Design a protein around this nucleic acid. Structure first.
Ligand SMILES: [K+]
Ligand SMILES: [Mg+2]
Ligand SMILES: [Mg+2]
Ligand SMILES: [Mg+2]
Ligand SMILES: [Mg+2]
Ligand SMILES: [Mg+2]
Ligand SMILES: [Mg+2]
Ligand SMILES: [Mg+2]
Ligand SMILES: [Mg+2]
Ligand SMILES: [Mg+2]
Ligand SMILES: [Mg+2]
Ligand SMILES: [Mg+2]
Ligand SMILES: [Mg+2]
Ligand SMILES: [Mg+2]
Ligand SMILES: [Mg+2]
Ligand SMILES: [Mg+2]
Ligand SMILES: [Mg+2]
Ligand SMILES: [Mg+2]
Ligand SMILES: [Mg+2]
Ligand SMILES: [Mg+2]
Ligand SMILES: [Mg+2]
Ligand SMILES: [Mg+2]
Ligand SMILES: [Mg+2]
Ligand SMILES: [Mg+2]
Ligand SMILES: [Mg+2]
Ligand SMILES: [Zn+2]
Lengths: 98, 201, 46, 183, 307, 63
RNA sequence: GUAUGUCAAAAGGGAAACAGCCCAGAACAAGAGUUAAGGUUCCAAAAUUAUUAUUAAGUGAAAUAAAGAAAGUUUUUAUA
RNA sequence: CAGGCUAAUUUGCGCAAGAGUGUACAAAAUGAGUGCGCGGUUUGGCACCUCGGCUUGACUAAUCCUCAUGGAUGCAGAAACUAUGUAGGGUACGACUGUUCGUCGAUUAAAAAGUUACAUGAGCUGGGUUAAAUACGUCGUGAGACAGUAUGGUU
RNA sequence: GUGCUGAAAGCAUAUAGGCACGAAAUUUACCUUAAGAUAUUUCUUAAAUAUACGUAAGAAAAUAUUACGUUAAUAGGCUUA
């Protein structure tokens, strides 16, 4: 193509820091909701599903925090900043093996 | 370095003088590394070198020995110069005591060498000039550097002598550069037993 | 001399060295052999 | 508005600062330990400090429209400190719009024709705003190859002690102590 | 940058503060470096100013016929000397001819007044190698300054041609003459490439313009005849300019200097023909101060009527 | 810049570091000798009369 | 074709310059106000801010050229 | 038509591996079918967008000559082969063809290529292509047509 | 491309360190143009100097450039060769 979308293949240490904090912030929203309901003895299927198949920022590997799965790439990995609205959508899990 | 650890046996007559660390101011460099001036004197002559300061020399007089050591073996630069500085000293000691020699063999029909004087091209008074007839339209004349003695026991053999090995072997290579040995007949100038494998025909 | 991107030893007398490296250029990897001068190789172009 | 009503004579005056390219600089050097390893300021790190003085951005009254910059006398530019192999592998280019007339030269070859002063002028020049004050500000940079320069009497002083001299900080403190004996 | 790599302002003078005696490297640029890289090519002696008088042939006593150009020396004098201490290079300033005082300006009238030399017509500097090439001020240079067989370089101004087209000025071939060509028989044709080459005419493009009236040097010309009575120096070959124009003759730069015995023999003739060059110069310098002081005070009229 | 608000931010110069170390839990008086020329109304102690009680050790000594 | 969004009909900040990407939806001003994306040696507002390692090639530093070669270097795991 | 995107293809190249040829012996030379790439010269795809010669250059380097140089059971010398540096200068004349291209004659150290709107028509040329005229062949019931041919045709 | 010394790595190595050879390319040199610091025991107190005008030209589209103007051979005429 001749139209230039200058998007670097890797992120800067500043974009990574904000990513860690956005993943950390989401964990606090879920924990705040889960703790508020536990005090009343209630549960929500969405929360129970999140805490079951989604890790916390402290439990994620750097590769899972800054990259995503892409079957079209050489090594099946791709910069997470290449996902649409990547700063406002949740993305923490990739297929096993990649 | 297994060579640097090896002590250096100072034969009789040879005297090693180690100076104190000094730095000469250079206007183009912000920091010059200190160096030590080592003078090896004896019968044939005297030689001097400037070694880095991280190389420590324990000169034993009554025992006539001198071992080298470095301040940090894990540094690449210190390891390298440990063996290099040891090798240079071993040559300085054996050169001021016995002297280094190089033999050049001239192979070919019409290859001759003669030692004479050329007062018109002499760089210093009494400079000897090795004249070589090597099949060229013109004569090849080379002046021996100050500090060496050249001779010709036979017309097809040259003998160089001096206290500095780097100066002797460098001059031998300057003469050999006129006729490098060829593989088809063996014609050329051979230095210190240098040989060349011949060809089929 | 043979210039290749994949230089390899061809006998027990071949040696890998990096020559012509100085304060201006990085140099080249060489295969030098005192036995056979047909083993001489260089990796990289000027 | 009270903070600006007064005598602005000395705020807009041209101060003559001095720096040596060979003296170690604990602030501008990257190595900070041990004390014997502290280097002088590298070419670009020194140039970035100078461009700030030439612009006047160290002054609390700074404004980009006003030319409130100072002078900077640099000495010992022959020992300009550089890292890696910049001295022999960095190239400076030049063209005059004529195809084929591209002029190239290395740093070591430029220091042989015009000395280390020109290497520092080019580095400071590119760090200044690209406007009509760039040539004036760059002209106030006084770069010399050795210790001799015609401004040994212009350098700022405090009690007769030039800034950067051995005991210039004691001369300054002695003057302020005697300045508090008033209402 | 205006010129070259140097961004230094044009009013700054830092040269005397960057000295080699202080341990600094010798620069590759500057007067000292410029002279050093021209020591082998700079002549040892000075030259002479001569007037091109015409061309002819030199007939040899055995059959030789050599074309040649005749250059006459008309009262060639040494007017001034240049030194490194004062100018940054060695050179001798030589004069030619005479000129009416009224046509000479007051600045030049006082320039010759301090030297004891009559006002000249043309001045020119000849660069020498070292301080041995400087000559006494006020000595006349004759054709014997050169010897037969001496190779010299001749510098002059070429014949002017005015505005010249592309054929005469650059050797352009032109275009066809009959096979349909329309109004473009002597024209330059295309002046460059299209958008892909800059959409502009490139600098240095060869175009019509003025031609000639520029300095031109012919190197390695032998001297065939030397006659002092006629004051001519016959050199082989052709020389730039018209008859009656002044040219500069000097030893060739691409050839070895003349023998040392000859360079000294010529300097020895100047001392014999002008043994009072220094006594007459200092006397003229002394008078200049007296007249210069009178002009300052306004009493010059007195010093004129006394004699 | 495009607006006066943006021009004010690009020309911003921070306050003096003395005013940045603000206090907490209460008020505070600090010694802040400015880098400026003093007015002629700051009479030196040598020009004060012997009766004037304001004569007193330097503020540095009062701290 | 399908799903989602933007542009189209959306200015503003970031991406050197930029219809479609990352933020964010311009009623008008004031403020060292609080922030987003994005950044903080100089051009140019903000760190020459701290910690641990690697690289010596200006590699790289806001658009990853491949297979491959190799006494470049570091680490780990076996081993003499 | 040109420019842009693309690179299947190319009369454009490189690297890797090495069946095999080289009396012997893989790598002097040679290199099946292949793999990994570069490049933007050819023929094409898309549809963002509706010739040749002469004169005069500039630039690239993947080099025909000239300069330095490694390898060469297959470098005795000479000449040539291959390869590494290197683009300063040169690369001409004629016959045929509208020709770039190509074929040929005869010299030469050599008679190499490419990009630039397949450089250059507000600088020239108009032979080719080329509207009106006309004929031939073929096609069409015909008016006419043709990637045909021929003579002529406001630059 | 070709070396000397020589270790890291007891050897080897033109690898680090210390020295060197080496091309129609480069740089210098050479030539022209531009640049205009500087020089002269230079000139100038209302000038030095320059221009205009006239005779021209080593110059020439204009312009510019280089000479001369009676204490003068600048152009023309005349005379001689
Ligand atoms: K004067
Ligand atoms: Mg584009
Ligand atoms: Mg004329
Ligand atoms: Mg013609
Ligand atoms: Mg006509
Ligand atoms: Mg343009
Ligand atoms: Mg234009
Ligand atoms: Mg619409
Ligand atoms: Mg917008
Ligand atoms: Mg940026
Ligand atoms: Mg703030
Ligand atoms: Mg700032
Ligand atoms: Mg880079
Ligand atoms: Mg379209
Ligand atoms: Mg060979
Ligand atoms: Mg050349
Ligand atoms: Mg075209
Ligand atoms: Mg056109
Ligand atoms: Mg007709
Ligand atoms: Mg080599
Ligand atoms: Mg060894
Ligand atoms: Mg060796
Ligand atoms: Mg010249
Ligand atoms: Mg006219
Ligand atoms: Mg007359
Ligand atoms: Zn081998």
């Amino acid at each position: 193509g001749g139209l230039l979308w200058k998007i670097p293949w890797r992120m800067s240490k500043f974009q990574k820091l904000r990513q860690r904090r956005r993943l950390r912030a989401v964990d606090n929203v879920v924990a705040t909701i889960e703790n508020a309901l536990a005090k009343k003895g209630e549960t929500v299927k969405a929360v129970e599903r999140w805490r079951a198949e989604m890790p916390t920022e402290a439990e994620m590997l750097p590769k899972d925090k800054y990259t995503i799965f892409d079957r079209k790439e050489k090594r099946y990995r791709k910069g997470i900043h290449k996902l649409p609205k990547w700063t406002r959508v949740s993305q923490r899990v990739n297929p096993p093996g990649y | 370095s297994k060579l640097g650890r090896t002590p250096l046996s100072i034969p009789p007559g040879v005297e090693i003088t180690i100076g104190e660390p000094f730095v000469k101011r250079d206007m183009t460099q912000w920091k010059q590394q200190p160096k030590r001036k080592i003078t090896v004197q004896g019968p044939l002559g005297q030689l001097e070198m400037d070694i880095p300061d991280f190389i420590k020399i324990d000169h034993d007089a009554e025992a006539r020995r001198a071992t080298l050591s470095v301040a940090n073996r894990d540094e690449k630069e210190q390891r390298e110069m440990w063996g290099t500085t040891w090798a240079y000293l071993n040559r300085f000691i054996m050169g001021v005591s016995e002297g280094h020699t190089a033999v050049l063999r001239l192979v070919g029909i019409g290859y001759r060498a003669t030692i004479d004087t050329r007062p018109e091209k002499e760089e210093y008074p009494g400079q000897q000039f090795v004249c070589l007839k090597l099949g060229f339209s013109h004569p090849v004349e080379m002046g021996v550097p100050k500090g060496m003695k050249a001779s010709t026991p036979q017309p097809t053999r040259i003998l160089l002598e001096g206290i500095n090995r780097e100066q002797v072997m460098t001059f031998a290579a300057d003469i050999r550069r006129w006729r490098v040995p060829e593989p088809y007949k063996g014609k050329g100038i051979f230095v210190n037993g240098e040989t060349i494998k011949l060809k089929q025909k | 001399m043979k210039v290749h991107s994949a230089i390899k030893k061809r006998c027990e007398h071949c040696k890998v060295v990096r020559r012509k490296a100085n304060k201006r250029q990085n140099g080249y990897l060489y295969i030098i052999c005192p036995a056979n001068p047909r083993h001489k190789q260089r990796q990289g172009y000027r | 508005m009270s903070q600006t009503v007064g005598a602005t004579r000395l705020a807009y005056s041209r101060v003559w600062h001095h720096i040596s390219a060979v003296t170690p600089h604990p602030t501008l050097s990257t190595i900070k330990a041990p004390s014997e390893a502290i280097t002088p300021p590298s070419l670009g790190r020194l140039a970035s400090r100078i461009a700030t003085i030439l612009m006047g951005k160290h002054k609390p009254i700074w404004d980009p429209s006003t030319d409130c910059g100072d002078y900077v006398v640099v000495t010992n530019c022959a020992g300009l400190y550089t890292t890696g192999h910049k001295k022999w592998r960095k190239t400076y280019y030049r063209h005059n719009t004529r195809p084929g007339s591209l002029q190239a030269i290395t740093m070591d070859a430029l220091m042989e024709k015009h000395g280390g002063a020109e290497v520092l002028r080019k580095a400071v020049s590119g760090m200044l705003p690209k406007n009509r004050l760039r040539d004036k500000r760059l002209a106030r940079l006084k770069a010399f190859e050795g210790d001799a320069h015609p401004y040994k009497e212009n350098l700022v002083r405090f009690g007769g002690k030039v800034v950067g001299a051995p005991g210039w900080e004691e001369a300054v403190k002695a003057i302020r102590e005697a300045d508090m004996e008033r209402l | 940058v205006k010129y070259g790599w140097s961004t230094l302002p044009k009013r700054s003078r830092p040269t005397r503060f960057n000295q080699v005696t202080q341990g600094l490297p010798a620069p590759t640029s500057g007067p000292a470096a410029a002279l050093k890289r021209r020591e082998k090519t700079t002549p040892l002696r000075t030259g002479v100013l001569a007037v091109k008088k015409g061309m002819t042939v030199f007939m040899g006593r055995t059959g030789a016929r050599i074309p040649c150009t005749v250059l006459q020396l008309d009262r060639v004098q040494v007017v001034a000397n240049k030194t490194r201490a004062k100018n940054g290079y060695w050179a001798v300033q030589v004069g030619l001819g005479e000129r009416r005082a009224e046509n000479v300006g007051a600045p030049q009238l006082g320039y010759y007044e301090a030297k004891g030399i009559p006002p000249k017509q043309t001045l020119a500097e000849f660069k020498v190698r070292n301080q041995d090439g400087l000559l006494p001020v006020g000595v006349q240079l004759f054709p014997d300054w050169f010897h037969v067989g001496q190779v010299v370089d001749v510098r002059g101004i070429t014949r002017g041609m005015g505005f010249a087209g592309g054929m005469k000025r650059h050797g352009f071939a032109g275009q066809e003459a009959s096979h349909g060509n329309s109004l473009n028989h002597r024209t330059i044709g295309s002046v460059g490439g299209s958008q892909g080459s800059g959409s502009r005419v490139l600098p240095g493009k060869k175009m019509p313009g003025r031609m000639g009236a520029q300095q031109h040097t012919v190197q390695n010309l032998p001297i065939l005849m030397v006659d002092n009575e006629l004051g001519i120096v016959v050199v082989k070959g052709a020389v730039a300019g018209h008859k009656g124009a002044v040219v500069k003759v000097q030893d060739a730069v691409k050839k070895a200097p003349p023998p040392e015995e000859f360079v000294e023999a010529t300097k020895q003739l100047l001392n014999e023909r002008f043994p009072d060059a220094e006594e007459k110069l200092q006397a003229a310098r002394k008078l200049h101060l007296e007249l210069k002081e009178a002009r300052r005070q306004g009493l010059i009229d007195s010093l004129i009527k006394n004699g | 810049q495009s607006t006066a608000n943006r021009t004010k931010r690009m020309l911003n110069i921070p306050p003096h570091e003395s005013f940045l170390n603000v206090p907490v839990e209460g008020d505070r008086i600090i010694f802040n000798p400015p880098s400026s020329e003093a007015s002629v109304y700051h009479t030196p102690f040598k020009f004060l009369p012997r009766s004037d009680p304001r004569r007193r050790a330097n503020i540095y000594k009062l701290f």
